[PDB]
Amino acid sequence: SQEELRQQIAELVAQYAETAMAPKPFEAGKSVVPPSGKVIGTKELQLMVEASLDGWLTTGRFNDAFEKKLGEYLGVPYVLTTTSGSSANLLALTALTSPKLGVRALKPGDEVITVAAGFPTTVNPTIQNGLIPVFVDVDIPTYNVNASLIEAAVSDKTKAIMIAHTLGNLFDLAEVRRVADKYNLWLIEDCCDALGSTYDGKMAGTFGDIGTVSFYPAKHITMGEGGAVFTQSAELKSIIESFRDWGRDCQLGSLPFGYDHKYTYSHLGYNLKITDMQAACGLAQLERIEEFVEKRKANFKYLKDALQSCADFIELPEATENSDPSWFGFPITLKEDSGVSRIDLVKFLDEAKVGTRLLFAGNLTRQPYFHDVKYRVVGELTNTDRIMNQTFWIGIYPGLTHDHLDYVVSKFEEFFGLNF
Template sequence: METAARPQPTVNHDRRLVPTGGQRRRRSRDDLRADRRLRRAPRGTGHSPPHGWQKGASGVNDQTSQLHDIAGQADEGQLRGLILDLVGEYARRHHATPAFVPGASPVPVSGKVYGASDMQSLVDSALDFWLTTGRFNASFEERLAARIGIRHVLTTNSGSSANLLALSSLCSHYLRDEALKPGDEVITVAAGFPTTVNPILQYGLIPVFVDVDIPTYNIKPEMIEAAVTSKTRAIMIAHALGNPFDLAEVMRVAKKYNLWVIEDCCDALGATYDGRNVGTFGDIGTLSFYPAHHITMGEGGAVFTDKPRLKRVIESMRDWGRDCWCAPGTDNTCGKRFARKLGDLPMGYDHKYTYGHAGYNLKITDMQAAVGVAQLDRLDGFIDARRRNFAKLTELLTPYEDVFILPKATPNSDPSWFGFPITIRKGAPFGREQLVPFLEAHKIGTRLLFAGNLTRQPYMKGRDYRVVGSLENSDTVTERTFWLGLYPGLGDDHLGYVADVLKGFLTKLVNN
């Protein structure tokens, strides 16, 4: 766990619902405007704890009754501050990361990195008991949009859902002749994670598989234009393990043939190409906030775009397919809730229950967003740590390039590395089936490059797809590639141990 300076608790008094005379009233527009002002206010400007409460370990008194007495004297803001201070103390005492012991401690490929402020933000949201998306989600979407440099961010419950929303939005009737239709082709890569490709199949489109390059593990740039036919309507590709694909060539082809572009950035938050954040080149970008990813909410994801029309469709698809865009707990934002006639519905049919799409319910809770807000504060540090770990592991493993193909960044890019892919060279005196179990037996976590060649997966049998050229490298990935962790919870001691174990494995081979 990241150990940070002890934060002052952030106390917020805005509510979506507030008690009045034993009842809860719905918030007014003035209340909502106050929310927005509070979200723009500097953090950490809450009430002081009640008299008699001392911060720090010495303030957690031995007698519970004294704590109850202090709490009994506190107003709502002070009591909240007291609770959050105690949560911070608990986090520092009971969520500290134990020291690394080589051979005894695990070296995971990924994991959540969190501190007292993350737990305090989560509890702050829980005290609101606003269980759907609310003030924390609004803050997260606003801050993430600013960080990426994009106009619209919409959270969703996973990166896979983000990909589903991105692709499904391009099939919307709102896009008229530009909409994707069953039978249209979408260019993608054969080696990757299934949920980059699955929405293509689910909407009756045809995936067109292109091989990847080694050692970038991204789409072969020279094959993109070769994959285009009169049926091609879109390109949907992931930035492999945080390494950007060749966006210059992808966007050149997309512009030439008027193709939609979806950038799956689930493993690449913070990566840049030509100095610009990935996800901002194409029409839509997606992210994941699963614990393995750059920041986490536990489960969660996001879809983002600069195009207001796409934002409207994505929001509708995420929120049951309804036409209403009111936030949870608010009504009649447009002022025309009962003043429209849509479809074959009667005049004045409640806009809140009018549906323009066959949508889903893919929102997150405000408690998840609260964790995300705190995680955003340390995103830059997380990215820096991943880059440092990549450089360190490259340095440590360079002596073994006679048997390993080490990863390389795409030219003109600055990756935000998700993992460290290694391909065992053809002709090496060992195979992945020997090395990976050896590493796992020494508590070093490994992963394959997701599904490998997707066309070889059981669920693809009998499905309609097209392959352009050879998938030789995708087969190599399936048979000889794995990756190691770089996440910020790892340091030089972990990586040094990994290098020592690999050296031991290779030395044993030579001696035998």
């Protein structure tokens, strides 16, 4: 009678969701236009109940299904789930320190090339593994690494490049891969805000050795808290897994014969696994990713077209050459000769119920926790500093309707006095 009880519960929740998770009609001056948010329906809540009923708890039925369907969407054979994007970035960079990679293994002291205009945990794992971060400037209005500056940052200590596809926009993969392959550097693609982004027709994350993604509520799809590491190399997939799972194996050491393999450890590991409840949510969301990716590209096009009327005061976002960005948010840099400060605009928008966000750390090297970190900067961080000082982004996620954006646009116009 269980199979029944399930399907009956599946109904009771489906009708609970249609009432709860229902889109509220937009209302200027009352409704908010957040920079991001999750979009969950019946399928999400249903599967989470299914997982709750299973009583299994740790990863299993749903986690297998999720890692599989996500591997399909991405076009990669190996996908490992983890606690968050940050955790995924950590596993990705840590995995390359495995002595199983012989001479290719990252060692304390080695250098990782990246940029300072990003999210802290894109860089932290490098520091947390005793490596030295080496920064170069980014470009505006793509808000991604200025590829041309990469080559000069390469020294004999350089072992890898780890940068994110900022806000869904892709970086110059053509130039990055060129510099990577030339010097035999590892490459890690932080796609935490770029699920669905393509470059030269190929899905983001599948160009380098390892790719990461996040399932925090603000990203493309969510599990509440969750993330994933994916690769095409079986060797890396096994190393990542070991690090995630207490560092356990699957010879060295002097353990007695017959010692349980389960309790044999080959790596300096962590326990960064998730539950099947989180997996379920993720699984339902995967049924909406294609839609989500399309609505983001649309909202971006619409919004930008409309906002072109303020081009004298703000610089609008531009997708990177030869790429089709699955926009995470809408970045805007306010001109210095506009007569007002970012604070003014943000505060104005805030009062208008229009949410905004700065570009994460702005300039990592100027963040307080970077006070005593050992790092190198090649060239100047002019654009990064400009980002920290003048840049901010707004919302184009699936939860925003054309009426939402129209409102945001009129506010920008009202602000700059363009409605007169």
